[PDB]
Structure formats: C-alpha cells, structure tokens
Amino acid sequence: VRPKITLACEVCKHRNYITKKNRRNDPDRLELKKFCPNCGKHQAHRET
Amino acid sequence: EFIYTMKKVRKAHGDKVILDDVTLSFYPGAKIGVVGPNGAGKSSVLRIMAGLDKPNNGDAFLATGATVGILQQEPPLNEDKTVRGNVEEGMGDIKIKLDRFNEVAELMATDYTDELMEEMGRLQEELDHADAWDLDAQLEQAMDALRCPPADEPVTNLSGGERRRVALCKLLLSKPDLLLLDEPTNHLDAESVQWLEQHLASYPGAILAVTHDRYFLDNVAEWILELDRGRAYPYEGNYSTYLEKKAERLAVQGRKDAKLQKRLTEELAWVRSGAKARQAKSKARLQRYEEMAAEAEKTRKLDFEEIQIPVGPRLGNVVVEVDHLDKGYDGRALIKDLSFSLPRNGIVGVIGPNGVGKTTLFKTIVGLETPDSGSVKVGETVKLSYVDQARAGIDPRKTVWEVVSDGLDYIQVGQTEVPSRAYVSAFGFKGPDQQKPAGVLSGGERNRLNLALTLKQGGNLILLDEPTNDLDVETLGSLENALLNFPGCAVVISHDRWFLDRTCTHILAWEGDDDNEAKWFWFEGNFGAYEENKVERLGVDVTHRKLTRG
Amino acid sequence: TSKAYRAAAAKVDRTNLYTPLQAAKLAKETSSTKQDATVEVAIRLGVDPRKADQMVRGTVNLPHGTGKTARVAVFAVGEKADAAVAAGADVVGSDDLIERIQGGWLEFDAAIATPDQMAKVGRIARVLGPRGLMPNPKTGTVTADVAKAVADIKGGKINFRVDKQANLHFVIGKASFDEKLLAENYGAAIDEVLRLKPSSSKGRYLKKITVSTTTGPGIPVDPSITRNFA
RNA sequence: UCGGUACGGUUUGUGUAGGAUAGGUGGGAGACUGUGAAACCUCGACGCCAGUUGGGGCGGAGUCGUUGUUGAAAUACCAC
Ligand SMILES: Nc1ncnc2c1ncn2[C@@H]1O[C@H](COP(=O)(O)OP(=O)(O)NP(=O)(O)O)[C@@H](O)[C@H]1O
Ligand SMILES: Nc1ncnc2c1ncn2[C@@H]1O[C@H](COP(=O)(O)OP(=O)(O)NP(=O)(O)O)[C@@H](O)[C@H]1O
Ligand SMILES: [Mg+2]
Ligand SMILES: [Mg+2]
Ligand SMILES: [Mg+2]
Ligand SMILES: [Zn+2]
C-alpha cells in the first residue's frame, strides 16, 4: 500500500529520485520541484 | 496483416485491477461483439485502441496507416452548431483545407504570383486524395440518413437523445479502418437502430461493438469477446453459437468449483485442529492449502446488493391531472389536446420515437416547464422524484459521495435520518470506492449514481427517464423486481421493447401522422395489449439510406 | 458476343510474358476488325497507397502523337490569351464563359488558364475538377507559359494518377499507327514510373502488368524489359 | 470429402430526381439484327422500386442501344 515510485524530470526525463507515497490517499502522480543534476537548476518531476 | 494487436497488457491500479493479461489480436474486417457484466473492463479496452489512454504494461500496437475512431459511453460535442457537428472529426482533413483553397485564390498580384504553383497546386493535390471535394451536396447525404435535426440550430438543451444521432455522424463519416463504437444503441428508436443494423452489416472495416441488441450479435458479428473481470477470452461464431458453448462451459465449471470448495473444507481441519500429527513436514503441506485458497478468492464474486427504492408517505387518490394540455414551440407542434389521470399504484409507460417530446412531459410535472395553453394539477399529497434523460446532475470533477450527499452527514430521504454514507453503498459502492471521481465511473455506476441523487426524497411519484441503459441483466432484473414492490406511481420512458413487456400497467403513446403530428393516445392495460389494440384501430400497423456514395 | 473478338483470344499466349514489339502486333490484328481504337496500359504497383507519402503522379512526352480530338478551352483576358489564340485553340473563352459552362454548354475537352484568373477559375473548377479538368500547375495548362500551352495539348503531355487499388491507367496510341509509333511512347512510361519511385515500398516493385485496347482482350507484359522497348 | 495458396472465366452492389450510378478508375460511337412474348419466366444475383440484353429449345424480320437529359456520373463496351 506504500509502493516505491521513482520521479522523472519533465524536460530531460532522467530518473533522479525514489520515494514512497500512499496509494489510497494519492491516486494521481506526484509533482515536486526537485534538483536535476544534468540541468543544473530545479525542475518539475512527475512519476512514471 | 493485423489491424490491432496487444502484448501482455495490464491496465490497473495496484490496489484494484481493471485489466489483467489481455493478449489477443484482430484481423481486418473483424466484426467483433463484446459481452460481459458491469465492472469487467469493456470500455477500458476500447479506450486503449483509440489512443485515449495508455496501459501500465504491455504494448498496444495499431497497424501502420489504419486510422481508428471511437464513440465513448458518453458522447462529447462542441457548443457551436449542428453542421459544425460534421466538420470537427469526420470530414475534418478536407473541410479545414477547403476554404483555404478558396482563400489562396483571391488573386493577389503584389504579394505573390508564381508561388501559387507549390501551395495552391499542393492543395489541389490533397483534394484528389478524398476523390470528392464539393462537400456540400454530399453532406445532406449524411444527415438525411440519420434523420438528423435541422442543421442550423446549436446543441444546447434544443437536443434530447438525438445528440447520439449527431455523434453517429461525426464518427461514421471519417470511415476508420478500426471502428470502436461503444454501445451505439443508447437512446435510439425502433427504427434508428434498424437503420444502424443495415449500415454496420455492409461496412468495409473492422467493428468492435459493446452492444446488447440481437440483430448485430447474431448476424453481423463473427467473433465474440467475453470480458471476465480483468481477464479477456476470444471465441469464434455468432452469439447463438456463443451461448450454447458458454452453457456447457459453465456446466463443467459449476462442479469444477463445487469439489474445489469441498476440498478446502476437507483439509481445513487437517491444518487447523490437531497440529500434533506431523513434525518438520508441516511447512510443506500447509503451503498447498494457501496456494489453493488464494486462487479460491480470485473467482469468489457473489456479492451483489439489491437496488432498493425507499418508501415515504401514503399516496392519495389523485396524482396527476392533465387539463387539456397543449405544449410546443414556435412553429413546432408537440403535445396537443391531452388529458389523462395517473393511476395510484401502477407502472406507467411512455412510447414515442425521438423528437415527439417525451422528456419535456415530465419537466411540466416537476416544475421545470410551464404549459402553453393548459394546466397540470399536482395534488397536495404526491412528492416528485425526477431522474433526467441527459443525466445532468453529474458533476464530473468532485467525488461520488459529494454528488449525492452535498458533503453533509445525514440526508433526508424516507422521513428518517439516514446516514448519508450508508445511503451510498445501498446502490453499490462499498467503502473506499466513494473516493473516486464521478466522471470516470462505469456505464453501470453512472446509472447507479443517477438513481442516487434523484431518489433522495422518498417520493411516491418517481419519473424514470431512460432507466434501461448501460446496465446488465443482473441489475435490470434487480430493478424490475424492485419497482414492482413500490407502493405507487412509477412512470417510465423507455425504448427497450423487451422491458415494457415485463413491467407496465398503462401506456401513453404517440400515434401521429399527416393530419396532426401531435396526438397522444392513452391506454388501460399492459404492453401486451397495446400492440394488439393498435392494429385494430389504425392502418399504420426499410429502403435503406446509404450515408455515402458507396 | 462476337466470334471476331474471340478469334484473337487464341492470338494471346497464357504464360508467356510478351515483348513490346510483339505487343502491338495484336493491336493491329484486333482493332482492324472494327473502327479506330486506343491502346491501354494497366500497371499494378507493390506500394501501400493508404498513406499519403506514396501518391504517384508524373508527366510524359509523346514523340509519336496522341490522336486526340483535343478541344481546347482558354481562360484568360488581355495579352495572356493573345499569345495562345494563334497557337490553335478551337474555342477561346474569356470571363463571359463563367455563365456558359455551368448553364449547359459543356462542349470542351481541355482547359487552359492563367494565374491571374483563379478567383473565377475556382468557381468553374468545382464541376470541372472531379471531371479531371482541374487547374494543373505542373504540365503547363495553368502557369506563366501563355505561349506554348495550346501546343502541349497537341504535344502529348498526359499525367497518370494511381488509384487506391494500385492501378495505373495511361493511353499510348491509336489503331492506325504501326508498331514503331508505340515503342518510344511506352518505354518512357515505365521510366516515368521509375522517376516517381517510392522509397518506402516493399517486395517486388512491379508485380503484374498488362496492355490492351478498347475492344481488345488481355495481353501479358514483361516486367523484366527495361532497355529493349524498340 | 473438408480447408489454405496460385491462376482463370462467369456473377454480385437499389437515399432522392432520371426508363432500379451495370461498384471504383481510365478510355471510347459501338453492338448487328441475338425482337422477348418457352422454361430453375422475368440472365435463375439482390428477390428491399416488382429486375441487372445471355444454360435462350418462335427466330435469322424488327433488338434496353447512338438520339432523350432530371442528376458528383445515368448510358452501349471490353480491359486492369
Ligand atoms: N430546448 C428546446 N427548445 C425547443 N425545442 C426543443 C428543445 N429541446 C427539444 N426541442 C424539440 O422537441 C423535440 C423533442 O424534445 P425532447 O426534449 O428531445 O424530448 P424527447 O422527444 O423525449 N427526446 P428523446 O427522449 O430522445 O425522444 C426535438 O426534436 C426538438 O424539435
Ligand atoms: N480510471 C479508473 N480508475 C479506476 N477504476 C476505473 C477507472 N475507469 C474505470 N474503472 C472501473 O473499472 C471497471 C471498468 O469498467 P469500464 O470499462 O469503465 O466500463 P464497463 O463497466 O467495464 N462496461 P459498462 O458496464 O457498459 O460501462 C469498472 O468497474 C469501472 O468503474
Ligand atoms: Mg491530501
Ligand atoms: Mg461501457
Ligand atoms: Mg427526450
Ligand atoms: Zn532535468
């Protein structure tokens, strides 16, 4: 009920972060501003 | 070679799967019929094939240059016009590039003269791709076959259930090579389906229908695709061949699982009581109980709660008095010179084709209209309950519980204080399935939701308007054996001719011809009498239109 | 329906792919029974014309002529029509011909216009277009060449249009012409097929082909002749 | 005896207006007396307008045809 999701950037689509969410609380894919190292600045990140 | 194909496709939430291991493939010209219960995934397979969603595993691969159409279970439109409803899709790669050919030829001379050779002739190239580009004389060809509304009026509340006749003309003009028509025969007539019968027969291209009618499934379809709840199984033959081999399959499956359930109980006590029996082997025999008990719970599905209509006040002796009513619009002549009482404790049926005015007649009774020259007496003991044809009380963003309860805790239904969450699961939403949005609900659970916010008053005068749509035979029988046990005045508009033969006591019906198009005949008795009274009083007791050049 | 048509059915061998020299001998033997005829070409293509990247059309040159009645309509005013009225057009039209064509006087075959007329051509091409008389920017009926447009109708420039069914159709000659007035016309036709050769087709390219006439039966044609048409 | 491939002849299609677009594309004054008024008739196809010149057993004479012009196109005729 707590699966491990990975978070991919919007522009370069690299996979930089893995984390846990609750699936009966949040059905849709998360969005966070995290730090993409290949871009050098904070970008948006959905799930896969 | 294959129009459409699937790998190990599994569209699902990880808590609740809706497709699982769907491996099959289709040919060109594959007329398919899809059958199954509600809650299987019949519309979440036709949604992958038109690219409107993506699976969570497995590749869904259309062919190279074959385009696909779709008609969803609710048809969207645009709010512009009616002849706009034949240019958006369908003729959309010709019409948008039709005025531009008339725009590039406005005879500019200072701008460009010899650049009319690589763009105006290129637009001349694409008109030959369609083999016809006048587009006008062959567009009344597409609306004098569906019997469309007059093309110069917007699709506001002006359109009733012939909204579907327009959406069966955006789709059947594109002529896709894979045609995903999901329940086309909602809200249609005794002849609007009869047109669609002969049109889907001689149709070059594949066809997937999720229909329930019998002329398509017995004569047009060649493959039948059963959808079990997550599974998918193809079969070959028409629907008469399907149900015979389905019957002998569920025969030997009915005692496949009897001796399975007998086995689990015979070695239930072997693993629970008396664990003294064997040492250091017991962790190898205990797992064979769990490996058959975890597959005994993947077909344990028999939990189907009944549709129940609550009872409120005592209904008196007068319910609906219609005092020589006329109703119509500017130039239009619907209901004219009609007078009828409404029988206490009796199911009332309404008969008429699309465009006679059946659902406006209930809007008079609740109060959403006003009669032109007439009056309707309500009677101070009745209580209305109006479920609409267009299902307009569904707000497709907020969740299921918030549509029917308005965020409250107790709602007022049967002169009691019912806890409003318990009133939700009474129509089939167990627990954590309140929390999912109503715009994505199934065709059963959008018809098991419109009965929730409209039977919320316990009224002894309920006005059912298209109740027999998108629900299977387990609920359709559980409806008709639940509005017989209701103490008064259920009034039903329907088109399922094998529904009014079950549950009817009175019939209001249209009988108009070329003297006046707004007659309404009243009858005392069931549908198995009106079909015999009609042939002995009137004389009215084909020639198919092509929709294209050929 | 006639023995004379079926007497040439024995004059065609079944499983022998003929040569273009042996092709036109049967046209001299079948069409001489009746009045003048026209030799037809049918070519099946190994393409997938459901897509739009494989539509095939090209022009052609006829050094031996066409034998066509070639009734020429001109759509120009001023000096644009003056450089072509002496070129041999039978009925030279103007802006007044808008009301004579759609009124019921449709007696013309060709159509030549100028790029300074398309606000009035586009209302006339609504009926002439699906009849195959669309304004052509390629060959010369609608271009800036207002001098050699009428002579191209007697010059022998006919486009070829593949259908959805992968069928090419193009006439090559009359009946009174001999065999040597057909080798130069037919050899350039398959060349112009190769000049619009797709880069996305598969298998064998030209898998079946035949050549016949108006009142003549079928004749096998060799796909493996590309050099010895004469 | 039941099915696949390859080739070949025959046959098949009816919004409304016109003597049922004889289906698409490309040509083209042709068919020669075969009247249609024997039959599984009406080409035996669809049998929805009740009819699409060919297993034709009065014939060798007269043939839906070209002419007529309602309709994106009616028009014989073979070929892909
Ligand atoms: N809002 C409107 N204003 C004016 N006329 C309308 C309106 N809605 C419908 N009509 C006309 O009334 C006819 C029928 O009304 P409608 O509301 O569709 O009832 P209905 O006949 O029950 N629809 P249906 O259930 O599919 O048969 C339509 O064909 C229109 O001509
Ligand atoms: N996005 C979704 N998320 C979760 N469950 C869904 C979603 N979409 C559909 N479902 C449910 O999954 C099942 C799939 O059914 P669906 O394909 O939506 O229609 P259907 O019930 O299978 N055919 P029908 O009964 O005629 O509507 C139903 O129980 C739906 O309620
Ligand atoms: Mg939250
Ligand atoms: Mg559905
Ligand atoms: Mg209605
Ligand atoms: Zn990035």
> Nearest CA to C61 among C185, C224, C195?
C185
Calculate the CA B518 to chain-centre distance: 29
In chain B, whose CA is at the least distance from the CA of A3? B14
- How many degrees, rounded to 5, is the angle at CA B305 between CA B395 and CA B20? 75
Counting ligands in written order, the one closest to the CA of B360 is 1
Judge whether B73 and B43 are in contact, CB under 8 Å: yes
Strand partners, A3: none
Tell me how far apart the alpha carbons of residues B9 and B18 are, in angstroms, rounded to a whole number.
11
Tell me how far apart the alpha carbons of residues B409 and B305 are, in angstroms, rounded to a whole number.
22
Counting ligands in written order, the one closest to the CA of B47 is 2
Give the number of other CB atoms < 10 A from CB of residue B398: 14
**Residue C104 exposed, middle or buried by CB count within 10 Å (0-12, 13-18, 19+):** exposed
Q: CA-CA distances (angstroms) from residue B347 to B190, B364, B456?
A: 21, 19, 20
- Find the nucleotide nearest C36 (Cα to C1′): D28
Calculate the CA C24 to chain-centre distance: 18
Residue nearest to nucleotide D21 (CA to C1'): B549
- How many degrees, rounded to 5, is the angle at CA B326 between CA B325 and CA B330? 160
Beta-carbon contacts of B232 under 8 Å, excluding residues fewer than 6 positions away, are: B19, B22, B23, B24, B41, B45, B225, B226
Say if strands B461-465 and B490-493 run parallel, antiparallel, or are unpaired: parallel
Cβ neighbours of B105 in C, within 8 Å: 118-119, 121-122
Judge whether B238 and B245 are in contact, CB under 8 Å: no
Conformational region of residue B119, where left means phi above 0, alpha means psi within -120 to 50, and beta covers everything else: alpha
The structural architecture, per CATH, of the domain B4-245 is 3-Layer(aba) Sandwich (3.40)
CA of C130 to C1' of D69 (A): 20
- Find the nucleotide nearest C216 (Cα to C1′): D78
Tell me how far apart the alpha carbons of residues C26 and C32 are, in angstroms, rounded to a whole number.
10
Tell me how far apart the alpha carbons of residues C149 and C83 are, in angstroms, rounded to a whole number.
9
Calculate the CA B407 to chain-centre distance: 28
At residue B201, φ and ψ (nearest 5 deg) are -75, -65
Sheet of C40-44: strand order equals C167-169, C40-44, C208-212
Q: CA-CA distances (angstroms) from residue C82 to B109, B169, C47, C75, C145?
A: 20, 51, 45, 11, 12
Beta-carbon contacts of B163 under 8 Å, excluding residues fewer than 6 positions away, are: B75, B77, B155, B187, B390
Judge whether B29 and B10 are in contact, CB under 8 Å: no
Tell me if domain B4-245 and domain B284-541 are identical in fold: yes
Rg (CA), chain A: 11
Q: Residue type for B79, please?
A: E
Residues 8 through 47 of chain A touching chain B, CB cutoff 8 Å: 23-24, 27
Beta-carbon contacts of C51 under 8 Å, excluding residues fewer than 6 positions away, are: B64, B65, C200
Strand D bases, protein C-beta under 7 A: 7, 9, 13-16, 21, 23-32, 34, 48-49, 54, 71-73, 77-80
Tell me how far apart the alpha carbons of residues B225 and B378 are, in angstroms, rounded to a whole number.
50
Counting ligands in written order, the one closest to the CA of A24 is 3
Judge whether C57 and C159 are in contact, CB under 8 Å: yes
Strand partners, C173: C39
Helix/strand/coil (H, E, C) string of B274-313? CCCCCCCCHHHHCHHHHHHHCCCCCCCCCCCCCCCCCCCC
Strand partners, B62: B4
Query: Which helix (H) or strand (E) covers residue B418, if one does?
Result: strand B418-419
Tell me how far apart the alpha carbons of residues B89 and B174 are, in angstroms, rounded to a whole number.
7
Cβ neighbours of A23 in B, within 8 Å: 13-15
Tokens 């001023």 correspond to C78
CA distance A40 to chain B (A): 31
Query: Which helix (H) or strand (E) covers residue B524, if one does?
Result: strand B521-524
Q: Residue type for C22, please?
A: Q
| Beta carbons of B121 and C119 less than 8 Å apart | no
Judge whether B393 and B434 are in contact, CB under 8 Å: no
Beta-carbon contacts of C117 under 8 Å, excluding residues fewer than 6 positions away, are: B107, C75, C76, C77, C95
Tell me how far apart the alpha carbons of residues C74 and C149 are, in angstroms, rounded to a whole number.
9
Tell me how far apart the alpha carbons of residues B201 and B189 are, in angstroms, rounded to a whole number.
18
Tell me how far apart the alpha carbons of residues B205 and B3 are, in angstroms, rounded to a whole number.
10
Judge whether B6 and B60 are in contact, CB under 8 Å: yes
Give the number of other CB atoms < 10 A from CB of residue B263: 13
Q: Residue type for B54, please?
A: K
Judge whether B467 and B387 are in contact, CB under 8 Å: yes
> Nearest CA to B353 among B161, B156, B155?
B161
Judge whether B428 and B394 are in contact, CB under 8 Å: no
Tell me how far apart the alpha carbons of residues B488 and B382 are, in angstroms, rounded to a whole number.
10
Judge whether C59 and C98 are in contact, CB under 8 Å: no
Nearest CB to C143 within list B117, B124, B127? B117
Q: How many residues in chain C?
A: 230
At B415 the three-state DSSP class reads coil
Taking every pair of Cα atoms in chain C, the longest distance, rounded to a whole number of angstroms, is 59
CA of C109 to C1' of D27 (A): 14
Give the number of other CB atoms < 10 A from CB of residue B234: 13
Give the number of other CB atoms < 10 A from CB of residue A6: 12
CA distance B430 to chain A (A): 15
**DSSP strands (E only) in B44-189:** 60-62, 68-71, 178-181
Beta-carbon contacts of C121 under 8 Å, excluding residues fewer than 6 positions away, are: B105, C75, C113, C135, C142
Beta-carbon contacts of B497 under 8 Å, excluding residues fewer than 6 positions away, are: B190, B527
Judge whether B293 and B441 are in contact, CB under 8 Å: no
B136 close contact with C: CB closer than 8 A: no
Q: Residue type for C105, please?
A: W
Size of interface B-C (CB pairs under 8 A): 52
A2 CA to middle of ligand 6, Å?
26
DSSP string, C93-151: E-GGGHHHHTTT----S--EE-TT-HHHHTTTHHHHTTTT-PPPSSSSSBSS--SSHHH
DSSP state letter for B399: B
Tokens representing residue C65 in the block: 């002529």
Q: How many residues in chain B?
A: 550
Judge whether B56 and B247 are in contact, CB under 8 Å: no
A: neighbours with 3+ CB pairs under 8 Å?
A: B
CB-proximal residues (5 Å) to ion ligand 5: B 160-161, 359, 389
Q: How many residues in chain A?
A: 48
Tokens 């959805």 correspond to C164
- Find the nucleotide nearest C213 (Cα to C1′): D79
Query: Which helix (H) or strand (E) covers residue B234, if one does?
Result: strand B233-236
Tell me how far apart the alpha carbons of residues B447 and B445 are, in angstroms, rounded to a whole number.
5
- Find the nucleotide nearest C129 (Cα to C1′): D72
DSSP string, B357-395: -HHHHHHHHHTSS--SS-EEE--TT--EEE--SS-TT--
Query: Which helix (H) or strand (E) covers residue C30, if one does?
Result: helix C20-30
Stated in angstroms to one decimal place, the resolution of this structure is: 3.2
Q: Residue type for B76, please?
A: P
**DSSP strands (E only) in chain C:** 40-44, 73-75, 91-93, 112-113, 167-169, 208-212
Strand partners, B506: B348, B524
- Please tell me the experimental approach by which this structure was elucidated: cryo-EM
Rounded to 10 deg, the angle between the C183-195 and C20-30 helix axes is: 130
CA of C185 to C1' of D72 (A): 33
Judge whether B178 and B69 are in contact, CB under 8 Å: yes
Q: Is B117 in the pocket of ligand 1 (CB under 6 A)?
A: no
At C153 the three-state DSSP class reads helix
| Beta carbons of B15 and A24 less than 8 Å apart | yes
Tokens representing residue B542 in the block: 């084909």
Q: Residue type for B398, please?
A: K
At residue B465, φ and ψ (nearest 5 deg) are -130, 115
Give residues (CB < 6 A) around ligand 2: B 13, 18, 38-44, 73, 436, 440-445, 470
Q: Residue type for B377, please?
A: K
DSSP string, B21-79: -B--EE-TT-EEEEE--TTS-STTTTTTTTTSS--SSS-EEE-SS--EEEE-SS----S
Calculate the CA C123 to chain-centre distance: 25
> Nearest CA to B82 among B127, B134, B175, B146?
B146
Tokens representing residue B350 in the block: 């309404």
Counting Cα atoms < 13 Å in the Cβ hemisphere of B253 gives 7
Write down the domain spans for chain B: 4-245, 284-541
Tell me how far apart the alpha carbons of residues C98 and B237 are, in angstroms, rounded to a whole number.
59
Beta-carbon contacts of B182 under 8 Å, excluding residues fewer than 6 positions away, are: B42, B43, B46, B70, B71, B72, B73, B209, B210
Rg (CA), chain B: 28
At residue B533, φ and ψ (nearest 5 deg) are -75, -25
Tell me how far apart the alpha carbons of residues B175 and B169 are, in angstroms, rounded to a whole number.
10
Cβ neighbours of A1 in B, within 8 Å: 15
Tell me how far apart the alpha carbons of residues B393 and B403 are, in angstroms, rounded to a whole number.
8
At residue B62, φ and ψ (nearest 5 deg) are -65, 165
Judge whether B517 and B353 are in contact, CB under 8 Å: no
Tokens representing residue C172 in the block: 């090559």
Sign of CA dihedral B4, B7, B8, B13: negative
Judge whether B213 and B181 are in contact, CB under 8 Å: no
Cβ neighbours of A3 in B, within 8 Å: 14
Question: What top-level class would CATH report for the domain B284-541?
Answer: alpha beta
Tell me how far apart the alpha carbons of residues B299 and B305 are, in angstroms, rounded to a whole number.
17
At C169 the three-state DSSP class reads strand
> Nearest CA to B455 among B495, B493, B482?
B482
Judge whether C9 and C217 are in contact, CB under 8 Å: yes
Judge whether B372 and B327 are in contact, CB under 8 Å: yes
Q: CA-CA distances (angstroms) from residue B234 to B39, B238, B241, B246, B247?
A: 18, 12, 13, 12, 16
Kindly tell me the number of DSSP H helices and DSSP E strands found in chain B.
16, 19
Give the number of other CB atoms < 10 A from CB of residue B343: 15
CA of B37 to C1' of D8 (A): 51
Give the number of other CB atoms < 10 A from CB of residue B377: 12
Counting Cα atoms < 13 Å in the Cβ hemisphere of B199 gives 23
